[PDB]
């Protein structure tokens, strides 16, 4: 595919989730610059407010199209349109918490639509997630490669916690395009930095931003 994605795109998102039994719905309205690998979004909790867990666990669920890919690495994501692609992710936290997030991404006009599901279980009640002790995800480098023919990104993630300590989470995301004839990339990397730019007291309203750049390491 010869991508027709534009330098400026809009984003609409709906997330339905359940973490440690707490049900919630979050709506997102955003935009981004696909070729610059930058995007931002306004998130609003529509059901389940106020959330009783760390908002940070949800943020990476709020689209690799927004990553700056150099010409020498096939861009699986920008090639995946007009039909779109979906992804599945496991988030395994070091204290036993486990989450699964999925997103089905489609395109209508210049807007990407995202149908997101997020489920989390086994978080210790007095742990940093249920006690809202997280400050941010540190920047990261995602390792992209094919597993049984499916593009997969593995990441060593870490949440900085109050008290200046880290809490590790291992990510595995599988990406599946619905577009025919996509050229698959070889082993590569995608640097990321996700940030909550601002938020209200209970995180009912959050401004999120991500910068991502693909590269060949070394």
């Amino acid at each position: 595919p010869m991508s027709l994605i534009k330098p400026e795109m809009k984003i609409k998102l709906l997330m339905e989730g359940n973490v440690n039994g707490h049900q919630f719905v979050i709506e997102g309205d955003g935009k981004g610059h696909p070729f610059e690998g930058k995007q931002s979004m306004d998130l609003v909790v529509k059901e389940g407010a106020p959330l009783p867990f760390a908002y940070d666990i949800l943020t990476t669920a709020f689209n690799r199209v927004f990553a700056k890919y150099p010409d020498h690495i096939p861009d699986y994501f920008k090639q995946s349109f007009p039909k779109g692609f979906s992804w599945e992710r496991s988030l395994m936290f070091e204290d036993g918490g486990v989450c699964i997030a999925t997103n089905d991404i489609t395109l209508k006009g210049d807007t990407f639509f995202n149908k997101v599901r997020f489920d989390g279980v086994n978080f210790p009640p007095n742990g940093p997630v249920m006690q809202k002790k997280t400050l941010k995800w540190e920047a990261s480098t995602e390792k992209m490669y094919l597993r049984d023919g499916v593009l997969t990104g593995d990441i060593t993630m870490a949440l900085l916690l109050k008290g200046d300590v880290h809490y590790r989470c291992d990510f595995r995301t599988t990406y599946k395009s619905r577009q025919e004839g996509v050229k698959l990339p070889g082993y590569h990397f995608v640097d990321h930095c996700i940030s909550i730019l601002r938020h209200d007291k209970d995180y009912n309203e959050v401004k999120l931003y991500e910068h991502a750049v693909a590269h060949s390491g070394l």
Copy 2:
């Protein structure tokens, strides 16, 4: 609590799930002998038939009330009524597949009602689960203990596959009672044996059975 659960009880269940993008709904009608630790259930796929993955990954999601507890070990489950209890489980397969299952169990008359959710992601497309190469779960021994005050069961599970080889899965289930004043047990074990007694060609109809016995090891 002084349990009023009877020697014969009925079971009603509804599971909504999504594995590797495949959505499905399964209804269960069963019964069991709580004090003998035995139960059986008739399962029918109501939506999403025929399932494109190994039915076995779902079976343990289809109630520890059905486990023979000796008098010297507090029975967290039989004490959890009339209000009921819920559980959350992570299933981590050795080839990357990850599932989360949850069940909210309630009681009406002599019938346990089960609201079950099952989500699975990252299964390799040519793996034993997506290729339906499983034969059964082997019997197991669940290790029960408290983690940050929450009763937790960890298990070394294994699926026997065609070709006489095994496929490992690690289970962690957290159990949370809604009943006040429940007496918590110390570290103990629960032996299990779950079996599909019979099924039709595509597993649209399955007869399931479980035998479970709690003990103190040694």
Copy 3:
């Protein structure tokens, strides 16, 4: 093989180890009843005394011959003589500690000789292992099966700590016989209970005991 192992056997052992940089040597003199699955041993720290870490992490390194096997399950271990067998084990603790233990077991007369190596790394300095806060390993059930043709035992292990909490460790042991024509068992279980019967203040002298019984579950 038709085992000539006797109902009463002796044991000689030498362990060379290094945990978090601390080098040590421990000698063991013991005995056991192979067909009853019971054994005991006197252990003496010969170098590296006093150990600065929890002695309990070492104890399972101090022979599955000492397990009561029923007639219907092939006994890989009692069949492994006179040539002997060796085993390798990874111990993965939940806070990042990782140990590898190995033992080459031989037989001379009525005495099993054990050449043991134990290495442990990445234990947090203020963790329960380096701070000697363990009380005992809980009893366990080892799941025995073949992995790529090699007998393997996976176990959900747990150390009881001071303060009435548990610290999890996952075990994987691979067993390899040097005896020709050994009949391999199918999937089965081995219940264990290991205990330090008594010890001096710094654990320079320890009396250890293990009871183990193989079975088919259910």
Copy 4:
């Protein structure tokens, strides 16, 4: 400490190891440019030749001093002299193989001396490691942070195998300086690229090279 490490340094190394029961000794003679983050080494198998497993599993055991650190990130390694530092590492492969590597690094004149130990267990006999099917480690990005006060590096590593597929290994290295008053860095990254430049048929003689650069991501 105000580092006196020079732009050109020499390296002497001795590794004693045992993988899946195979004992070996390898000697290394090399050199590097600490401030450029580049080093190379000539490795010779002195005992245990020819190795029956993939040489690649050993290569990262053959010193973070050789990493280009920018001025804004404290360099734990170049500050660790003249007394030196040591490190411990767990290598957890996706098919069950587990290795532990350790290195005690000292300095005499302009030469770093390395006392290395490498132990590996539980590798499937027909797996890529025991069958020598690896081609190289892909480049990587190590995530550096403090865990219970100890500098730790976690990495998502991957070995490229014959047949154009990847084999994952998770690394955790803990670094411990013997030098007093070292300024600890905050969360950061170290990009790496390790390569076998050339080797003889059985890998008895190997020319190894590494390029590494520390950065703050984004």
